[PDB]
């Protein structure tokens, strides 16, 4: 919007950027009761008229000027006995368009969510296409690899002006100072034009028609301090007067939204399995290798020389992804856990088209609930009408803060909620010694109703199984048959154990609290849920550990499950636990492999899920089409 004031005293000169509203003030300097307007053919005057200020006179230019002032407007002021007094206006039209991929396919200054929304996407440039380097690509002020440009978002400035136009005008590209630390912009002929402590740049643009390409990288994920929006603006300046400051004639802009870090549920098809089972195990590792092949997965394995005896590949990292219309790449969220695997995500996982993030304090100030077996996501889910098409992040907490309670660090929680497309849900896991949601829940795919089952550990179910076995004559059957060094225990004495039953009633109650919580927060019905027979015991601080290998802590590789071998009571040549589980899951077309993790994992307080990790295929559904 511009108001040009015209004057019989003086001719007026003015620029008109196409796609802009220009109007005339014809009254303020008028000499005379009426006026007429006459303009050249490229000006459309939209509006023999009375000289009253309520008269809207609006000018539109059809196309760019070939020369300065090549369009013109004559305002004739005339009266009842006065010969006409004319006022002149000389116009110069220009095209100035800052473009970006605002329809989210392939190239209102407002970013809107949803299929009918608008606004271009920006990726955080958190991988490392630069060969033999340690740092992420967005850490320097240079484009060092041509393929790095694939991660960046294209923005273009198209101008169409007279050959002499930038004699007297200048263009400046800018970003707010509040945002300059979160973005870098490169000018393609690459050299940096905008970024940290570089909030504006004068552009060198020749007259006529020109097109200038820019490449934009984000430097920061959305977070509590950063909603995720970056605005870049082009300003046109009149630099005509040597005795005067520059004068803004026109501003236009593009708003980008930085892509959120997104997790993938056990229902997304697996692409790559990780273990760092180079340590004293080997048949464990053989078993996961067979599963990986059955599942058609790359297999990556971490040597004891790198592990540092840290076998818990689930816990230091979570492989998610970022996604823009032009580019999608996996991104490792590196837990601050910082144990033997500390170097693995930064040295072995991050790299070409493999992004990196971390959060939280890196030198301690951490808890077990920051290990990423405490970080999971549900399958897609619709809940009393609200749709969650990438699922809902699930993570474990206490039921209230006490001096004795634990939580995942606030920095991590805040980062996850600021990603806003998998709206996290706090679960209750602090009752477990280790403290992770992967100790009592899993999701697996299913061919029917909602496409998954929620699996939950279930003391109830194991008591039922064992009772049924004893009812049919097998109370002498031994739990822990098969084991080198273990006290065998008979079904009958397990059932008769009143303290064990007390402990497992308490655990049942903790698990049921989450059952109902997941029901509410995911819109699950009982028919979405399968109980896995599982016994627990309480130990130090009355905290819960698995009584026999925790079977819900499984590896889900499509229809192929890697389940800790419970070494349960052998009845008809078969562990009845294995039997029960198979009867529960095989009707969904899942294939159960029971992996001996006993001396290697189980007795160190984790199982098969805990010892492994999976990279899975990103959702087809584009995050930006959500309405969070």
């Amino acid at each position: 919007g511009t108001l040009i004031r015209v004057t019989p005293e003086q001719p007026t000169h003015a620029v008109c950027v196409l796609g802009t509203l220009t109007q005339l003030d014809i009254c303020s300097s008028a000499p005379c009761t009426s006026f007429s307007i006459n303009a050249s053919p490229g000006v459309v005057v939209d509006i023999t008229w009375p000289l009253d200020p309520g008269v809207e006179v609006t000018l539109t230019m059809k196309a760019a000027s070939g020369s300065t002032g090549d369009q013109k407007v004559q305002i004739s002021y005339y009266g009842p006995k006065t010969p006409p007094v004319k006022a002149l206006l000389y116009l110069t039209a220009v095209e100035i368009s800052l473009c970006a991929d605002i329809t989210r396919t392939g190239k209102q200054r407002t970013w809107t969510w949803g299929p009918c929304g608008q606004g271009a996407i920006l990726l955080v440039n958190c991988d490392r296409d630069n060969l033999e380097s340690s740092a992420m690509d967005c850490e320097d002020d240079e484009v060092l690899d041509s393929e790095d440009l694939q991660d960046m978002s294209l923005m273009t400035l198209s101008t169409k002006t007279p050959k002499d136009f930038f004699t007297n005008h200048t263009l400046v590209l800018h970003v707010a100072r509040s945002e300059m630390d979160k973005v870098r912009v490169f000018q393609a002929t690459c050299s940096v034009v905008l970024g940290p402590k570089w909030p504006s740049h004068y552009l060198m643009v020749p007259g006529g028609k020109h097109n200038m390409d820019f490449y934009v990288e984000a430097l920061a994920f959305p977070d509590t301090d950063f909603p995720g929006l970056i605005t870049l603006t082009i300003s046109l300046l009149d630099t005509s007067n040597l005795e005067l400051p520059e004068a803004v004639v026109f501003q236009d802009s593009v708003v980008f939204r930085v892509a959120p870090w997104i997790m993938t549920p056990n229902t997304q098809p697996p692409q790559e399995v990780y273990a760092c089972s180079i340590f004293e195990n080997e048949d464990f590792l053989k078993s996961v290798t067979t599963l990986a092949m059955k599942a058609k997965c790359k297999l990556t394995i971490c040597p004891e020389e790198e592990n540092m005896d840290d076998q818990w590949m689930q816990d230091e990292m979570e492989i998610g992804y970022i996604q823009a219309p032009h580019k999608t790449l996996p991104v490792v969220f590196d837990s601050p856990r910082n144990r033997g695997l500390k170097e693995f995500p930064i040295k072995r996982v991050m790299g070409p088209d493999f992004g990196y993030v971390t959060r939280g304090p890196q030198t301690g100030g951490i808890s077990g609930l920051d290990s990423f077996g405490n970080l999971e996501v549900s399958p897609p889910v619709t809940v009393r009408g609200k749709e969650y098409p990438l699922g809902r992040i699930l993570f474990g907490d206490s039921c209230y803060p006490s001096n004795d309670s634990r939580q995942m660090h606030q920095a991590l929680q805040d980062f996850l909620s600021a990603q806003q497309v998998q709206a996290p849900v706090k679960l209750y896991s602090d009752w477990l010694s280790v403290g992770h949601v992967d100790e009592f829940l899993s999701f697996v795919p299913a061919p029917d109703r909602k496409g998954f089952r929620l699996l939950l550990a279930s003391p109830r179910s194991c008591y039922k199984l064992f009772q049924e076995q004893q009812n049919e004559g097998h109370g002498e059957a031994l739990l822990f048959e098969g084991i080198k060094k273990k006290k065998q225990q008979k079904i009958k004495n397990i059932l008769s154990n009143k303290t064990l039953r007390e402990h497992n009633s308490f655990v049942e109650r903790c698990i049921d609290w989450n059952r109902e919580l997941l029901k509410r927060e995911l819109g699950l019905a009982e028919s979405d849920i399968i109980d896995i027979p599982q016994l627990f015991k309480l130990k130090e601080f009355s905290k819960a550990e698995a009584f026999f290998p925790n079977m819900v802590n499984m590896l889900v590789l499509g229809k192929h499950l890697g389940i800790p071998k419970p070494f349960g009571p052998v009845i008809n040549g078969r562990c009845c636990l294995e039997e029960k589980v198979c009867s529960l899951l095989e009707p969904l077309g899942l294939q159960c492999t029971f992996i001996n993790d006993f001396f290697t994992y189980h007795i160190r307080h984790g199982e098969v899920h805990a010892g492994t990790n999976v990279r899975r295929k990103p959702f087809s559904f584009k995050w930006w089409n959500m309405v969070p």
């Binding site: 077990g368 280790v434 403290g435």
Partner: peptide, 5 residues
């Protein structure tokens, strides 16, 4: 290594 600690 103990998972928890």
């Amino acid at each position: 290594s103990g998972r928890g600690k």
